[PDB]
Design a protein around this ligand. Structure first.
Ligand SMILES: Nc1ncnc2c1ncn2[C@@H]1O[C@H](COP(=O)(O)OP(=O)(O)O)[C@@H](O)[C@H]1O
Ligand SMILES: Nc1ncnc2c1ncn2[C@@H]1O[C@H](COP(=O)(O)OP(=O)(O)O)[C@@H](O)[C@H]1O
Ligand SMILES: Nc1ncnc2c1ncn2[C@@H]1O[C@H](COP(=O)(O)OP(=O)(O)O)[C@@H](O)[C@H]1O
Ligand SMILES: Nc1ncnc2c1ncn2[C@@H]1O[C@H](COP(=O)(O)OP(=O)(O)O)[C@@H](O)[C@H]1O
Ligand SMILES: Nc1ncnc2c1ncn2[C@@H]1O[C@H](COP(=O)(O)OP(=O)(O)O)[C@@H](O)[C@H]1O
Lengths: 346, 346, 346, 346, 346
């Protein structure tokens, strides 16, 4: 879109904490599409998407960045687990499923983005002949699908997750993984796929493949894929401090959410500064003491925390609960420094 | 629904004995949907379902709670065995089957809940032009399916059974299970699925995954799933006393049922207090002496018990059988303290 | 149906010899459906079918009882080999096939039971405008399928054969069987299935699972299945005496059949008492000397017996063959005390 | 087409650097089709396509040549990974997929090449009865598909990639690969395939199979395939000098592209001669120090290079960045002589 | 057809060099169909096709003979690799594919053989109401398909290639091959198959199965197949002399082809007698020095030969190149006595 690299980042800055290199990466990739548009044929179709290979540990924001990037760009998205195409069988759906999925969404993107767009006459004409039975106007599936197929073709964004899980001495008698990248190839290399909405050409689709690559290295990917993964960016682990921010700065952060949800019951809750430090500290503490699952750890802990309130807020209309460091210390309790429990409870 | 956490529990209290933590868990999860509704965009679609991971031994009420929760919430339900997606093949139906199944039910929920709802004119108009051929009015599959797709989207409840049976040194050369949670992922992570009733978006579906986790621990689930299993609740084994209650308090308990069914033959049966103690005692006794299958044990024993009466009630019209501790002791007999039989008969 | 437990048994008594416990079992199960009907909501849908687990050796009448039970109850039946769902592949038809099969039959049951029922006008209206082209009246597939889907739903009877062949140390590295009971589960646990005749709900279907259980024990079935197999009944082996009765009492016994078939050629045959003893004695004798295949053994022996007559009855119009103990002794001959032959000839 | 061997090469010369033998090869193959046309029946259908077996290391231009050849000949193309047909399963799409794919493209080639061709009346008739709803004229799918099926039949070009990966002592217990060439056979040997656009006959299709053949030798292919791979041509590795040219001579070379894309932001960038030498030198340097992935290496390096500018060009409107050898040395930096990084970053 | 055995052979003599026994074999088989026609029912349908088992080394003309036989008999043909039905899977198309394929061709044989046959009015009626839109007349798919299904039924010719590759101590634990001949059986044994053009009955189809049988012997085929392979004929290897003839006598021999193709560029080329000897000598020389691939060897060598001319003929309009033994010696060169190259270049 007309949005500039620095603008895209600010937008992302409002949802993801840290991971600047990554933000910068998706921004360039995205902006590059605005630049291509400006060019003229042949050079226009000539230039291919600047795909990205994010390299980072689970829970640092890899998917989030892509999802958000997609939203801010009003573009058809789609996440997919690379591993999906290896499980003994492959007798379900191949790589084309991705393009189909993505194509469906593109329609569902011009739809809702139309039934409530060019409908500058959902009144004064809907009835008087209520509404509802009005949406079925000006549609024209011949025009609807067109822009949809045009959407995926010009803006689609496929997120290939855990791609490092299909690389590569008894561990060598298995090269099927390489045969996978092979079937994945045509998509990134550009090609045409049949869909119930027409024929979409994956030629200008933006691909974002992430992966821990703790086992393998990007250089182990088949040459064809390395060539089509121009941008290499690495994400970093999150510090307890990062959790502290994520817990409240990102729009719709967890504290904002619980605060809003309880307000619904008529309960005004508040988070003491120290309390947020203790929360994020707990999340981090558990992650290093056991399996570090990144920022996700924040989910189970924040739920364990708001457990009590979350049940009886109904009974507490008109009160103001102040979640201070104590309320936390207690609500959590033994569960953190106790690995036996944490592996279940959190 | 408008029902509050404490109300949902009372409702459940009338069907399930014990397992409070679990009741509390599903109530919060359910209520949270009423709260979300109250919020405003973006925060509305922003908030995701508070999925649950029940951890408990077979026969304690895990499925029941979910089924009941679904009923009390007039919501599309669906149970499914996680193991189902691993059996050598997968050449039948993938994870999308769940969403489709669930979607079908949603229709069948707005249907019966309509053919006998807005039909405030199934008379005075049905005939006089009997009924029956009247139901085919005001329907409008364009509106019928809409709310249906809207139902699964806003209220659907998927119950993933035995999920601990797809986790994870010769026992390590098998990671297919992890590839399963992978394919299960998109559903819980929100996404769109095609169905004969339109396109349902799993984004706001409530997921309840239970599991013994005697083999593995929740922490062994792929990180993405842990993150999406916010609420962790644990159910407890049932004491013989619990059987004693289940045998008569839950609405439509087994004694209520047999009493009603025999009344049909004109036989009024009655259960002596001690007799119910002896029944539940037998159920429990067998469970610890052999394979403890929880409350299910009550089924075969109660059937062994009502065996005799259940056959000749027809012949006994107008009588009143009093099932006392003796009648039980006898009706059961050697079969309990005799493992050779119990493994067959009970 | 309106038939009482004692009546159902008398009916069965006219087709099956012995196996009273089993007869009693299916009768209770069947009658229980008449009782449920009488109840009122909720308790009506609340009560589930009293499924049966027959435990017995091959050839004693397990399937027969179920088939007969089905007939006497004018209910949609269906037998199916549990093993069917394990054979390397499963790339044909899953558990839903059962419900579909069963649903088809239900239609084919309201059909023939209609084309010749409400057709109180297959004359005086069929022609005069022969018949035949008349059956295509009053049908109305919208009403036809309805009762059909209603039939399977309220009366269907699935017979799961050899279920003990999907249970459970090198013999333990195979748990697929358990994954089978898993896929079988939803059916017995009640659920909805799509069919070319509408959507049938397996909730009130009567299930009869039989099995030798010489290898495994019922207690080895997954807990969920034990819980749904309330009634446990055991069938006994058949004595030579039992063969003697089966050979002539059951309606359409083998002697009745051959007698009728030969009458067709104009040959009136008769069975000497001793001859029937010798026949059944042969059947039994072979069964213990080699592989005991129960009452089936009676088929090959009775055919070996009527071999000669069965060919030239045509030539024997107006005669009266008397099959006495001698005729038998001879017709059979060496073939019985000679294992080399019996394993081929009988 | 009317283009002569020497003309085709000049055309290719403008896109591919080096690889003359290969250029010569595709030119002969292509021209041969113009010659065949001139002949008369029978000799016309008698002469078969002069298929090619390119033998060369990854990254030297094998696919490019074929793609370009296809473009210059306005012919339906299609690349496909031979390995694709071996991965455990084959339960997706066989060799016919190739012909179908290729056939689709042929339509999509007469389409765009028509909606904007014989449309010498997309005005003066489109409206006045804007345009758009005009394209749906003179089409006639009966004529559209015809030429399409005629296109693939007379001009189609299938590019079979990595064919040396399906040849052939524990490494001999696997001959499935040979069974692959077997299924691939009919296509090259000429035959008919069903497609949603009619029936295409692969008889006159031009096949280009490439392969490293570092493992196996062409002579190891099944005899039938050797016979149908008339032209054998070998491509050479690329020297750093070759990278230097590729970096700027081929139409739409990478420097041309970045220069154009930045111009979009209002930034006029320039590449110092030495800077291009240093760039190509880096690409080559990394390739020999680690995994040599041919010219592809140029992608990640050129992206690492334009990283900084590519982000803030927006901020730099009206400036003129001069990328000299220094700017490069710096922009790249440690990343090249440092293998730990290169395997990730480049 | 009306053609006699000696006539069929002369026809073949004009395309295949040598292999008389084989020519004789297909002629008898073919003529036998003319004789059957003359007979009267029942003896007419009574007589089955005299199928053939060609036994010979690759490259001697086995397929050619069958293809040619098919052409001269204006009959639906079809080659198919027996191995095709064994490759792990069989989840694509079974033996019926053959009959379907063959049936398609039969239509495509009455089609082109009609659109330009009974069309004695593709003018004087096509326009004047140009042509083209005329072909769609008198067709009548009800008559078109009829003769087509009649074609395959009465004239179809299936060529089963490499059948010796599905026969038969660790090499014995694999009998799947025998199960293949089993599935192949019904076809040769006569039967009916469904097709989009109706139901074709394989009863009178002519089958030609060839095979090296260097591994196994015909006698190893399942008995049923031996019985249906009446005619056993053996083909011989080709001498360098045979190559010399093939190089110029068969209609549309390779020298005829290149001569014609170059004439297109305005270049009149000529082959010195000795030059043809040297060419064929090279083909043979390479075949014995490395892998003997029969006459195919002639393809790569003749292409290596005409390489130079084939490129610049364009530049040589009006010249007359004389390919003498020298031109050859040179054009080939080291490549023949050098195995390292031959295995690539030739
Ligand atoms: N830097 C970050 N800023 C905000 N939220 C984050 C960040 N890193 C992780 N998260 C949160 O943690 C979860 C991480 O999942 P995701 O973004 O897909 O990344 P990854 O795939 O690397 O685990 C999401 O719920 C996201 O909101
Ligand atoms: N706490 C309880 N209260 C009432 N019934 C119970 C309870 N626990 C188990 N049951 C009965 O036992 C069976 C248990 O199955 P279910 O509820 O699915 O739980 P689980 O999956 O843990 O075995 C059901 O028939 C249910 O009625
Ligand atoms: N008790 C019996 N009374 C009458 N017929 C019997 C009896 N037992 C077996 N049979 C006959 O033997 C065969 C037994 O098969 P079936 O009834 O399916 O039982 P099972 O599956 O235990 O072998 C049937 O043909 C049936 O007529
Ligand atoms: N000789 C060359 N001239 C121009 N570009 C080349 C050359 N060799 C390789 N490339 C570039 O490198 C990549 C090589 O891929 P491709 O042409 O498919 O060949 P290969 O399959 O041998 O790797 C393409 O992006 C192409 O532009
Ligand atoms: N006797 C022959 N006469 C003419 N051409 C032959 C002869 N033998 C082989 N060929 C040529 O060599 C190739 C051999 O393939 P084919 O005829 O299928 O036999 P095979 O399957 O035994 O290799 C064909 O291109 C054919 O023209």
């Amino acid at each position: 879109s007309e949005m500039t690299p620095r603008e895209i980042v600010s937008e992302l800055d409002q949802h993801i904490i840290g991971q600047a290199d990554a933000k910068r990466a998706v921004a360039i990739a995205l902006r590059n599409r605005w630049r291509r548009m400006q060019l003229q044929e042949p050079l226009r179709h000539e230039v291919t998407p600047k795909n990205i290979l994010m390299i980072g540990p689970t829970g640092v924001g890899k998917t989030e960045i892509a999802r958000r990037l997609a939203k801010l760009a009003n573009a058809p998205f789609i996440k997919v687990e690379a591993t999906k195409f290896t499980e003994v069988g492959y007798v379900g759906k191949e790589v084309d499923s991705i393009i189909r999925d993505l194509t469906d969404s593109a329609m569902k993107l011009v739809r809702q983005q139309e039934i409530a767009k060019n409908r500058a006459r959902a009144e004064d004409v809907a009835e008087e002949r209520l509404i509802d039975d009005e949406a079925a106007k000006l549609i024209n599936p011949e025009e609807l699908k067109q822009k949809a197929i045009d959407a995926v073709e010009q803006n689609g964004i496929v997120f290939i997750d855990e791609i490092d899980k299909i690389c590569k001495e008894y561990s060598g008698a298995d090269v099927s993984r390489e045969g996978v990248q092979r079937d994945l190839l045509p998509l990134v290399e550009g090609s045409t796929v049949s869909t119930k909405h027409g024929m979409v050409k994956t030629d200008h689709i933006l691909f974002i493949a992430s992966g821990a690559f703790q086992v393998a290295r990007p250089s182990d990917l088949i040459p064809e894929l390395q060539g089509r993964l121009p941008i290499r960016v690495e994400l970093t682990a999150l510090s307890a401090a990062d959790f502290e921010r994520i817990l409240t700065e990102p729009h719709a952060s967890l504290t904002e959410q619980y605060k809003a949800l309880m307000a619904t019951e008529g309960v005004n809750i508040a988070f003491t500064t120290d309390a947020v430090k203790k929360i994020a500290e707990a999340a981090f503490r558990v992650n290093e003491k056991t399996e570090n699952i990144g920022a996700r750890r924040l989910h189970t802990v924040m739920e364990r925390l708001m457990d009590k309130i979350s049940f009886s807020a109904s009974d507490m209309n008109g009160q103001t609960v102040n979640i201070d460091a104590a309320y936390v210390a207690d609500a959590l309790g033994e569960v953190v420094e106790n690995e036996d429990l944490s592996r279940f409870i959190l």
